[PDB]
Amino acid sequence: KNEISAEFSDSIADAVQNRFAALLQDENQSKVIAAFVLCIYEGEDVAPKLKVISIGTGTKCISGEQIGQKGETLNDCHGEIIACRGFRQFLYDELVKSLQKKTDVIFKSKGNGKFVLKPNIKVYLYINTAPCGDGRVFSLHVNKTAGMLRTKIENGQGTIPVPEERLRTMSCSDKILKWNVLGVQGALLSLFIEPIYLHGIVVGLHYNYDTLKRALIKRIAKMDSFSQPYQLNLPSLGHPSKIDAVRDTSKSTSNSFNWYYGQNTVEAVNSITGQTVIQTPSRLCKLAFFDKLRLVISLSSNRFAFQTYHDAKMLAKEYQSTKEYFFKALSESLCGKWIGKPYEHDMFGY
Numbered sequence: 001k002n003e004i005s006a007e008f009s010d011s012i013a014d015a016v017q018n019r020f021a022a023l024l025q026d027e028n029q030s031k032v033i034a035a036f037v038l039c040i041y042e043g044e045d046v047a048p049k050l051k052v053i054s055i056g057t058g059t060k061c062i063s064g065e066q067i068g069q070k071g072e073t074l075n076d077c078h079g080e081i082i083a084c085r086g087f088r089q090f091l092y093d094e095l096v097k098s099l100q101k102k103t104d105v106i107f108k109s110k111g112n113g114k115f116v117l118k119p120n121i122k123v124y125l126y127i128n129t130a131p132c133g134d135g136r137v138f139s140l141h142v143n144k145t146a147g148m149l150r151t152k153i154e155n156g157q158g159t160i161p162v163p164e165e166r167l168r169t170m171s172c173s174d175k176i177l178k179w180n181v182l183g184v185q186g187a188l189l190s191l192f193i194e195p196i197y198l199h200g201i202v203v204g205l206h207y208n209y210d211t212l213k214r215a216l217i218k219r220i221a222k223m224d225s226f227s228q229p230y231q232l233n234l235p236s237l238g239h240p241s242k243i244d245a246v247r248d249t250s251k252s253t254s255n256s257f258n259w260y261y262g263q264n265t266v267e268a269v270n271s272i273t274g275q276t277v278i279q280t281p282s283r284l285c286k287l288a289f290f291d292k293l294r295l296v297i298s299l300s301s302n303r304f305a306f307q308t309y310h311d312a313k314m315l316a317k318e319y320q321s322t323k324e325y326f327f328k329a330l331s332e333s334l335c336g337k338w339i340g341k342p343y344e345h346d347m348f349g350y
C-alpha cells in the first residue's frame with residue numbers, strides 16, 4: 001500500500017493551515033493551496049518537527065499572448081507549481097548560506113563538490129485538492145485517457161490529453177510525476193546539489209490512492225535503467241481527514257499568492273499576466289532564478305561558461321539526460337509526447 005496515516009496527514013495539513021492564517025489577512029478566496037513541508041527528525045525515536053517552507057495558491061496560467069522573453073513572466077500559477085518555485089528559491093538561499101560556510105543549513109557536503117540534503121530532513125508536498133491532469137482521472141485497471149499526459153486549458157481551468165493553442169503548459173500531475181524522476185529542484189540547482197525527492201505527498205479533495213499512485217508515481221511502470229543519483233522515487237501518499245470545503249461557487253480568482261521561508265511578505269501575482277499586481281516581475285520568475293544562479297556562481301570556486309539561461313540549464317548533463325530518457329519512456333508507453341516551450345523563451349542573458 002504505502003499510505004501515510006491519517007494522523008500524520010492531519011499533522012501536515014494542520015501546519016500548512018496555521019502558516020497560511022499567519023500570512024493571509026482574514027479572507028479565503030484561494031481555491032488551490034499548496035505547500036512544501038520539511039519534516040525534521042532530531043532522533044528517529046521522537047516525533048519530527050514540521051516546518052512549512054513554501055506556500056502557493058492559484059488556478060490559472062498565461063496564454064501565449066502575454067508570454068515575455070526576458071524571463072520576467074510566470075508561465076504557470078497553479079498553486080502546486082508556485083509552491084515548488086518558492087521552495088526552489090529557499091533551496092538557493094540555503095545553498096548560498098552553505099557556500100558562505102554557515103552552520104544553520106539544510107545541506108552538508110558530499111565529497112564530490114555537490115551538496116546533499118541532510119538525511120534527517122524529509123520533504124512533503126501538500127495540496128488541498130488533487131492536482132490537475134491524470135490525478136483527477138478515476139479509472140479501474142481495465143481505459144482510454146487514464147494515464148495520459150495532459151495540458152492545461154483556457155488559462156489553467158481544465159486539462160486535456162496532449163495532441164497525439166500554440167505551445168501549451170503541462171498539467172500539475174505530469175510535473176509532479178517529473179519531480180519524482182528528476183527531483184523537485186530543477187536543472188540549475190542540480191549543478192550544485194544532489195536531486196531532492198519528495199518523501200510523501202498529502203492530498204485533500206478528490207483523493208484516491210490508486211489514481212494518485214498512477215498519476216504521480218507509477219505511470220510508466222518501466223523507466224528503471226536509471227543513473228544514480230537519479231531513480232524512480234516512491235513517495236508515500238496521504239490524505240487529511242478534514243478540508244476547507246469544495247466551493248465551486250461562481251468562479252475562481254486570477255490572483256496567485258506566494259510565500260517562502262525567509263520572506264517577510266506575501267507576493268500577489270496576476271495569473272493572467274504572469275507578473276505582480278503592480279506590473280513588476282515576480283521574485284519567482286526565471287530571471288530572478290538566474291540572478292540567484294550567478295550569485296551562487298560568484299560564491300563557488302568553479303567557473304561556468306554559458307551564454308544564456310538555456311545554456312546554463314544544459315550544463316546539468318545528468319539531469320538533462322535523465323529528462324530525455326523520461327520523456328522517451330512516456331512516449332514509448334503511449335502516455336503521449338511532452339510539450340516543452342521553445343528554447344527561445346530561455347535564450348536570454350544579463
Ligand SMILES: O=P(O)(O)O[C@H]1[C@@H](OP(=O)(O)O)[C@@H](OP(=O)(O)O)[C@@H](OP(=O)(O)O)[C@@H](OP(=O)(O)O)[C@@H]1OP(=O)(O)O
Pocket residue numbers: 075076081084085169170175185186187188286313339340341342
Ligand atoms: O526542468 P527544470 O529545470 O525545472 O525547468 C522547468 C521545465 O523545463 P525545461 O527546462 O526542460 O524546458 C519547464 O519548461 P517546459 O517543460 O514547459 O519546456 C517549465 O515549465 P513551464 O514552461 O510550464 O513553466 C518549468 O517551470 P514550472 O515551475 O512552471 O513548471 C521549469 O522552468 P524554469 O525553472 O526555468 O522556470
Ligand SMILES: [Cl-]
Pocket residue numbers: 029030031032033057058059079252253255
Ligand atoms: Cl486559487
Ligand SMILES: [Zn+2]
Pocket residue numbers: 078080131132133171172173
Ligand atoms: Zn494544476
